[PDB]
Design a protein around this ligand. Structure first.
Ligand SMILES: [Zn+2]
Lengths: 83, 99, 189, 208
RNA sequence: UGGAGAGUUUGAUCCUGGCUCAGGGUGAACGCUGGCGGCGUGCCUAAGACAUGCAAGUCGUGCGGGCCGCGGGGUUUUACUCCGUGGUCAGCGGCGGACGGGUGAGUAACGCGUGGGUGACCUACCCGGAAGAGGGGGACAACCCGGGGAAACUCGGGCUAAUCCCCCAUGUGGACCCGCCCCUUGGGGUGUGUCCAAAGGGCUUUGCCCGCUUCCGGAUGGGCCCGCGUCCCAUCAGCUAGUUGGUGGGGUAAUGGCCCACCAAGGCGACGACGGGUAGCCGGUCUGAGAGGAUGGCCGGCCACAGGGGCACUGAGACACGGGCCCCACUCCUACGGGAGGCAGCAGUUAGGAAUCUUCCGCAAUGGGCGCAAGCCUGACGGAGCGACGCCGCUUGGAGGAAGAAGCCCUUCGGGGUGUAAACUCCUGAACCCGGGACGAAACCCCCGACGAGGGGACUGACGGUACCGGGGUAAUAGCGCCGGCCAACUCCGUGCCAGCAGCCGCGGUAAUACGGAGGGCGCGAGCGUUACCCGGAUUCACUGGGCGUAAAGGG
């Protein structure tokens, strides 16, 4: 299936995560469909995490089933919140 | 040595057997239908064809032929039967044919 | 020590076995037995805490035997003596005893310092007695071998299909655990 | 690692004053004045005509010594300069200057470049809040260096300040002599620095 | 935004022209030397053999069963029993084991790269919607008995559940033949006829949750086909017999010579086929002014193989790395009849070899799989260990300080050199010890809100007591190459075409700026040089940008 998931890049002890859309059976670094956002765990930057919302929503609609952490991140950003 | 994946193999064996039963029987039925068509017996032949079709469908439903393969098989059989019927008969029961 | 079968007259073997007693455990050496004098003298390592001397009923006491005795003495051991093959008709333990006396070693039945137990190596005879004697010697002489800085000894080094570079170690001091850095000679790991 | 070892020997080798001690390297003592010739035996000998390569090499060495850096680092800096657009020489020089130690030296925080570097290393030098201990720190313009909180009351620093009390600083620099502060303002151009080095020669040397 | 040459055929010249060298780089290696720290990275050789440990399972919210545990009895006890249970243990049943991880032998090919095509197609799980889920029957493990066999294991009889299987009913629908219509290859719609659905558990149970069955729509994942690009050899010139096309059928999810029957005799080829060697390919990397040239390590994709070969089975997907069957090869046991194996998973063992790490800790993060969930699993991964193997960062002090100590070295005997270097004064304070001490980890979980959005709660650290901060606190490893020209930097002693050096010209046969040493220098520096390859210089394969009267070269 298709998942919204976090791809580790970066350095040892300096992790960086790509909030990304990809197939379930892939390398956690692998050929992903689209880069929707990015997240730094270490909170080192002011704009530490950011995801484009509309694209994410579209993906969800299509049926992109997110990872739990990813979902949390999305919620934090303001994707799942509706009015 | 030794892993709990032998279970899977065992399962497959059983499934294989069931599949074989489904498939061989179906094939036999098809052959019978063809034979019937050969001379021009029509009604019994038609019945047999219908039965074969049903069997095929059942197989498709289960984990045997599946998908469009079954449909293709049906088409192959049915068309052949129709062709054979052109050498005497015409749809007697109504049956598998579209008349 | 366990009751299984005989391995044969092969001149190799794996390493030291552990014989079981009602008082404790006794380690017995089963390397290549004869040595053919592997080393004339190591440096003064004390491989074995004690050393028994086997004497045949047909051969008697040999230069080899003498050398072994000397080695044992060098190591630091109260020598126990064993008269082998006493069930066969050519056996003469008295002669052996006399020879020992001549050499210098006086048994306890005459009044001295040496320990003499004859054994039969075919039927099953006096082994228990011998063991008991050994145990007594151990408590008497106070030959006892962990919180101290660990120390061992290499008995033999070989190669295996079902392992690798393998080294048969006997522990003198300390507690050896799997997953620790050690050096032995110039070779380490 | 540093050069480390005999200093004014290098100066002697070039034949132009290199100011590698500050004082004494100012007085009649840098060995430029007492003796002006290259070190070791054949220094006082007949000076032979040097090859085209050689002059350039010498110039490069002079430069490196003046800035007190490892060769690899220097090379890297040069490469970076080349990559960036402008005047590959002047820009390079500016970049070199931007090395924290050099800046410190300029601001009169320490009387010698090596000394400055040492000071920087030993947490005595702070760049906008944090004590920075690596002289390879490159400072981008409009940025504040200061003598560290707990190093403000040490004698050497005071002496340095006194020395630089009265005598002015470079046009790319400003220093608060009261509170041991120093802003690096402009990025130092070549025209600002009346250095004996010719960058062109260095560039040529590098080329092949 | 970018391009350095030089030494050398000669008595000297001019060229033509090779060789050699500086430049940079490597998955390198070797030598000497060797403080740390960050990060990257480490069998490029035998795709040789492989031990040991682990590398893929999980669901009791699918189901029966044994072993135990409890709360309570029925049970005097003992049973047996009943549930709630707590775990286990194996079985069935499902989902995953086709992902992840490795290696690069083969394959020079639609294998890849690339741009399309698929009216010739699949897509379990995911989401979007639609429609359902009515009844009846059955076997099979496990289990019990009974054997056979050294073991591996295994056959026989019987029992029993279930989301296992079957059968009937319904039909939203779809499946197929035939017809018709619109399309345009098998796309869409419709009519008659035939055929096809399913299955349940969970509770806070009259209510929802997870699952289910059929369908269409999507989503991703591919399968297959084609356009062009894809190494050297012409001393490989003809190759082909399912081979090229057809008709019919089979087989496929689907086309097709994929396979078969039959007809036809083609098809490809010098615009380089077939043959041999070579080689995974690329995104890239290294180099280069660029054009190019070489390489394909790590990382990312794709392919291919999991001792060699062959082949199916099960499923959404394999011709299946830690499944299967079979033959061979080999290792391992055998009660000689037979089985067990597969590290190109991590670590490690050997063996080859110049050469390559730890049988490490962890599920904490991310991701994977299963699961309602907790959670379980995870040698993916996160990290730590070792190696100057790369690359970068810092230390080995700083400031004084002789018209110049000693030591050593040369000298023309005055002197010069080492060298402000040292000693010595002053100052700082890696190491080091204490004191603290992380970011990474806020969620899934619970409760309030409808199990939605939203609100609060809490736990959860291998790295690691590490990084890092606060206090203290020692002056605290310098080495290697070269020094005739290229090419940076010179003297003396010793040696006497010897010993040696050398990359090239060549130095050495008694005053050697080329050899050994010493001083001195110069280059770099925790490194430096040697070796090997690659590119560069080499416009020495020249497209940009070479030439051919006499140089190599015009064919008679
Ligand atoms: Zn000076």
């Amino acid at each position: 299936m298709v998942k919204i998931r976090l791809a580790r890049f970066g350095s040892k002890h300096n992790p960086h995560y790509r909030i990304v859309v990809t197939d379930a059976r892939r390398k956690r670094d692998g050929k992903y469909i689209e880069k929707i956002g990015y997240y730094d765990p270490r909170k080192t930057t002011p704009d530490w995490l950011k995801v484009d919302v509309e694209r994410a929503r579209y993906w969800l609609s299509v049926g992109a089933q997110p990872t739990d952490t990813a979902r949390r991140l999305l919620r934090q950003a303001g994707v799942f919140r509706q009015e | 040595r030794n892993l709990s994946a032998l279970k899977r193999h065992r399962q497959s064996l059983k499934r294989r057997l069931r599949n074989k039963a489904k498939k061989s029987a179906i094939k036999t039925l098809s052959k019978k239908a063809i034979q019937l068509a050969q001379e021009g017996k029509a009604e019994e032949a038609l019945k047999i064809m219908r039965k074969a079709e049903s069997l095929i469908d059942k197989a498709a439903k289960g984990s045997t032929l599946h998908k469009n393969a079954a449909a293709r098989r049906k088409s192959r059989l049915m068309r052949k039967v129709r062709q054979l019927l052109e050498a005497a008969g015409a749809p007697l029961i109504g049956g598998g044919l579209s008349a | 020590r366990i009751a299984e079968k005989e391995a044969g007259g092969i001149t190799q073997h794996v390493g030291a076995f552990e014989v079981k007693t009602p008082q404790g455990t006794v380690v017995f050496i089963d390397t290549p037995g004869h040595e053919a004098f592997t080393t004339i003298r190591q440096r003064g390592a004390k491989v074995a805490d004690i050393a028994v001397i086997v004497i045949a009923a047909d051969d008697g006491i040999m230069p080899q035997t003498e050398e072994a005795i000397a080695h044992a003495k060098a190591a630091g051991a109260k020598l126990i003596f064993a008269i082998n093959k006493i069930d066969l008709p050519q056996a003469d333990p008295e002669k052996v005893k006399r020879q020992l006396m001549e050499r210098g070693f006086v048994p306890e039945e005459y009044g001295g310092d040496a320990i003499v137990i004859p054994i039969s190596a075919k039927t099953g005879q006096g082994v228990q007695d011998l063991l008991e004697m050994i145990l007594l010697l151990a408590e008497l002489e106070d030959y006892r071998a962990p919180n101290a800085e660990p120390r061992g000894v290499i008995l033999e080094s070989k190669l295996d299909k079902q392992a690798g570079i393998i080294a048969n170690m006997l522990v003198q001091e300390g507690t050896f655990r799997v997953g620790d850095y050690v050096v032995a000679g110039e070779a380490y790991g | 690692g540093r050069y480390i070892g005999p200093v004014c020997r290098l100066c002697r080798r070039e034949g132009v004053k290199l100011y590698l001690k500050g004082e004494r390297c100012y007085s009649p003592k840098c060995a430029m004045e007492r003796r002006p010739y290259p070190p070791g035996q054949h220094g006082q000998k007949r000076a032979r005509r040097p090859s085209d390569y050689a002059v350039r090499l010498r110039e490069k060495q002079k430069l490196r010594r003046i800035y007190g850096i490892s060769e690899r680092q220097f090379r890297n800096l040069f490469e970076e300069a080349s990559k960036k657009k402008g005047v590959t020489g002047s820009v390079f020089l500016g970049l070199l200057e931007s090395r924290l130690d050099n800046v410190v030296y300029r601001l009169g925080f320490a009387v010698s470049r090596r000394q400055a570097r040492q000071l920087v290393r030993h947490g005595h030098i702070t760049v906008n809040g944090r004590r920075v201990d690596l002289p390879s720190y490159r400072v981008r313009p409009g940025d504040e260096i200061a003598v560290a909180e707990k190093s403000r009351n040490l004698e050497l620093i005071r002496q340095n300040l006194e020395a630089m009390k009265g005598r002015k600083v470079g046009p790319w620099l400003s220093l608060d002599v009261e509170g041991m502060k120093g802003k690096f303002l402009r990025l130092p151009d070549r025209e600002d620095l009346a250095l004996p080095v010719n960058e062109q020669l260095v560039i040529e040397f590098y080329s092949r």
